[PDB]
Ligand binder design. Structure first.
Ligand SMILES: COc1cc(Cl)nc(NC(=O)NS(=O)(=O)c2ccccc2C(=O)O)n1
Ligand SMILES: COc1cc(Cl)nc(NC(=O)NS(=O)(=O)c2ccccc2C(=O)O)n1
Lengths: 355, 349
């Protein structure tokens, strides 16, 4: 089912700030090589793409890629099957896909000088970090070790090169500025649903506490848990007796309470072990991270919330990776997202696209 | 008219290579913080988006952004009007839009360490360059100085912030590897037309000399001229008597003459002066660069080619900037591109 009919499509930039270099710009002096002198730089802006079907229904969906990724992951799978962008435009939702600040078509703040440095000011760090193919293989649970697949895997085997090519580094932009850009987007588009992934899990939770327009969250395998300030439960270290999960993000309880006002679903794939797994660091990391999220959701529900954890194996889907929405069964994964939208009345009424 | 009917859409990665770190990867060791140890990295790959109409008519178009840009510039204008992607899908062409290696969704090659450095090897330079808003204002000929517009301007005034936000740095990926990625895309697509802009002007010319599937080129304000090796004409310096245009790219004549086998059109907007202008460096730069391109096109035609220069004011369009395809009259600019495709049979199956 590849055909798509759009009432309109396009893209735009939103958010960000400006920084300035020293002095004044003289149009008579050679402009190349580029100089910081007299410069204004736009930094930390976000790229947004939208596609609106004919006669939209329900709330628009905002798909927010995980760490080191772009909106590509919602457009197509590594082997070329339709991504959730196409599937949900066909499902009659207006679909927004973003490249957050520091990723893809979002801004990478660098100037004339060492990476990220504007004269004496470090806007982002010159030293970068970036996962290897091997680190991503085990992070994404293709298998327990690079080159190996779980026998039940839903990964599109044969398209490893395509898959890993979509991943890259992120400069050290503050999470505050990333959240700020998406808050501005959701304010502009109206009531909407956030669909997040991995690193954008905690960021989407934060956006919701700042923006009443977020009416629901579906988070695919969020990477960082969130708790009210001062009320982070003790969580055991990993099986290696040394490592820990990502330090949970703490927000003031007045903001945390807003998470109890909308439906929230965390979706996990397969092959996260139940038992401690000292031989496979990322498998063990996912075990304890999933547990931490269970405690986070419990805190939301004790405030009157509607927060749930969906393990795809319990719904009859086996072998999903950390990217269920590009796996071979992503149509069945999409159906469960449609079910969430229908359960909570988020697919109702004629809707108009605006930003 | 914003409606579009797509038989299919999607995106993929193509091209690139791999580099490796030292040692072995042990899955029992902490994976975070990320390490180069035992690492394989995919670098210099290109992002490609495609949209195919129902019943495509004529060759697919490959829209290739200029320097510091992305495929966004073909999707929408800064004020939110349809870009050439929509306009030419409506015109029944399959449309490819790329983010070249180093830009947008293309790969930026960096690792665990100083930007661009893999252990002791510099894959790209740690020191970056990037235009300011001020430099882009005058490069793009919005006006002669930042904050000023030419009075005839087709720029979408009021949307300056949207416009400049689309621009950014490019790492020092070799032009050879950028050309390589697009050659591989042209192999994948089959016969096609390249529609280039500024920095990708010279790169698209190079691609055509390596890819016979390029059946035509339309280049919006190419930034670097190209000549047969040993046959670069002397070109005068700029009015400040010290600056020069970008050193022209030289290729073997036997590659260069492949450019004579396909139609090629260079498109220039407005407000490039005829007189030397010492007060306005980028205006003078565009004057001498347009002249160099005129000699480049002459070299192609001397070899039996079909190369031409279209000044938009001669076609009745006044006030265009360096981005005619996002200006307020971009529908009329698009009509001139359709005219080129029709003249050369590139809108026919
Ligand atoms: C890199 O180092 C640190 C340290 C700390 Cl404390 N927190 C983060 N945040 C992330 O979500 N980092 S991630 O972005 O690569 C990621 C990690 C695990 C699992 C998944 C992801 C991810 O791809 O989203 N990264
Ligand atoms: C920066 O310094 C050099 C040196 C040399 Cl030799 N060649 C280039 N190539 C470009 O096209 N550089 S550009 O990318 O910023 C650009 C410049 C002028 C006019 C237009 C553009 C452009 O945005 O495409 N840049």
């Amino acid at each position: 089912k590849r055909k798509v009919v759009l009432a309109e499509q396009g893209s735009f930039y939103i958010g960000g700030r400006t920084v300035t270099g020293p002095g004044k710009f003289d149009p008579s002096k050679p402009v190349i090589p580029y100089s910081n002198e007299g410069a204004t730089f736009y930094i930390n802006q976000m790229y947004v793409n939208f596609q609106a079907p004919v006669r939209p229904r329900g709330l628009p969906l905002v798909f927010w890629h995980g760490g080191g990724l772009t909106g590509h992951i919602w457009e197509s799978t590594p082997d070329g099957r339709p991504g959730f962008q196409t599937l949900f435009v066909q499902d009659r939702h207006t679909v927004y896909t973003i490249d957050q600040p520091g990723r893809g078509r979002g801004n990478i703040p660098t100037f004339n000088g060492p990476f990220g440095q504007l004269e004496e000011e470090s806007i982002v760090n010159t030293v970068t970090g970036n996962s290897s193919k091997e680190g991503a293989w085990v992070r994404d649970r293709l298998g327990p070790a690079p080159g190996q697949f779980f026998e039940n895997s839903q990964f599109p085997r044969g398209y490893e090169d395509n898959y890993f090519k979509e991943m890259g580094f992120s400069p050290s932009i503050s999470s505050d500025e990333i959240v700020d850009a998406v808050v501005k987007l959701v304010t502009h588009i109206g009531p909407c649903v956030l669909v997040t992934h991995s690193a954008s899990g905690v960021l989407g939770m934060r956006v919701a506490t700042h923006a009443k327009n977020v009416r629901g969250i579906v988070a695919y395998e969020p990477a960082t848990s969130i708790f009210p300030k001062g009320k982070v439960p003790e969580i055991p270290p990993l099986a290696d007796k040394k490592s820990q999960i990502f330090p949970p993000f703490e927000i003031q309880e007045s903001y945390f309470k807003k998470l109890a006002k909308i439906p929230i679903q965390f979706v996990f794939g397969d092959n996260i072990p139940k038992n401690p797994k000292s031989a496979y660091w990322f498998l063990d990391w996912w075990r304890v991270t999933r547990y931490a999220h269970s405690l986070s959701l419990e805190a939301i529900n004790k405030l009157g919330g509607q927060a749930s954890l969906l393990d795809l194996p319990t719904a009859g889907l086996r072998g999903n990776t950390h990217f269920p929405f590009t796996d071979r069964n992503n149509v069945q994964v999409a159906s469960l997202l449609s079910d969430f939208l229908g359960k909570h009345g988020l697919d109702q009424n004629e809707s108009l696209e605006h930003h």
